[PDB]
């Protein structure tokens, strides 16, 4: 327990950005490395994470590897995600609430490793930045991407220094092409309850 | 090159009746690389069994491992697709412990982020780590019980009369629980009742 090996199944809410909610997961070490439950449905449900995930029967993995100082964000597709690190890296992650309301414009920040997840909703920016020299970071999600469909996806620039954020290292970033070219939030239209 | 930008597709395994080893589109930048390790909308037309959703059960874990490791040879009731979530590389291997036809059939081959394998549930599961470390990630469908281990299926990976072979078997790194399991000789073959 504590660090890294060994913690008890946990969830706590994240009280500026309604819905959200981050996950202590055991990690079991031993001589060879380590194993972990990254996701145990009759498990983590009596913890909070949402039954709605599983409205349409929809379902894909993703993962992404990536090297120290890349930053990826901040993007709000209309689906959930529920992500995590699925090697010994670690990320700074980061949130930005995108939704219509109270909470418009409201932010977290955390770190992740392979002993922490968070349940992002719908509605809700996703980014991070590598702290490690490099990482997996693997994650969960209830509604399928299409290039095509890009243009009505929402997303807002990691670099607009109105957000209430603060990232590990701004200057030496490596960004691609489409996180270099996101709106300012002044330019984000806020998001209706699912678009109604 | 053999890594990058394949194309999505499926092909059976003859000896083992229900497998399928997938090719996965891997996408490279000046970040590092982005895949869809798992995608129903397209998956299930390539033959990835509807059957897998039958009951609403799902469950991902990971386990990371040092060069020279070896997990196996495991087949608990449920189905596995599998894959590696990292740059590492695994000698993955199968052994059929069904009752019928192909009792004691097998298969091997190497797995690196751009492959993934579906396995029946009855087919043994095992792989022995190539690179420095490896980040080894699998969805199933039903749930592990520590009271319920001695009940699960398993054969010993060290057992020669087994139709593998492994990448370096003398400087192999395994469990205790592992170096235990029974022989191919002492596992009876498994009855659809029993999965
Ligand atoms: C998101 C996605 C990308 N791709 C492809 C398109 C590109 O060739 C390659 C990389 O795509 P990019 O959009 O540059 O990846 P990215 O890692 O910058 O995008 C991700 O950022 C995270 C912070 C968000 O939470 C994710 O939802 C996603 O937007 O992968 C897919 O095939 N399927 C997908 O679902
Ligand atoms: C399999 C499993 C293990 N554990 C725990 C129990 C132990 O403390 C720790 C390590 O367990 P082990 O059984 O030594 O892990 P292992 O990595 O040797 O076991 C795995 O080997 C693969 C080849 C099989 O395909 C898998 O189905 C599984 O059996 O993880 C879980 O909490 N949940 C699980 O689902
Ligand atoms: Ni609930």
């Given at each position: 327990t504590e660090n890294f090996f060994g913690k008890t199944l946990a969830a706590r809410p994240v009280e500026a950005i309604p819905g959200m909610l981050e996950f202590d997961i055991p990690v079991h070490g031993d001589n060879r490395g380590w194993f972990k439950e990254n996701f145990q449905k009759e498990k983590m449900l009596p913890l909070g994470?949402?039954?709605?995930?599983?409205?349409?029967?929809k379902l894909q993995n993703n993962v992404s590897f990536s090297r120290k100082n890349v930053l990826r964000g901040l993007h709000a597709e209309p689906w959930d995600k529920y992500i995590s690190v699925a090697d010994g890296g670690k990320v700074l992650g980061t949130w930005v609430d995108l939704r219509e309301?109270?909470?418009?414009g409201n932010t977290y920040q955390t770190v992740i490793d392979a002993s922490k997840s968070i349940f992002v909703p719908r509605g809700v920016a996703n980014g991070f930045q590598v702290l490690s020299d490099f990482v997996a970071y693997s994650y969960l999600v209830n509604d399928y991407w299409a290039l095509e469909l890009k243009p009505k996806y929402a997303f807002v620039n990691?670099?607009?220094?109105?957000?209430?954020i603060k990232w590990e290292n701004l200057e030496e970033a490596e960004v691609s092409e489409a996180d270099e070219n996101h709106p300012f939030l002044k330019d984000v239209k806020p998001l209706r309850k699912e678009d109604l």
């Open positions: 994470f949402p039954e709605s995930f599983f409205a349409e029967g309301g109270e909470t418009f990691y670099a607009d220094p109105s957000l209430d």
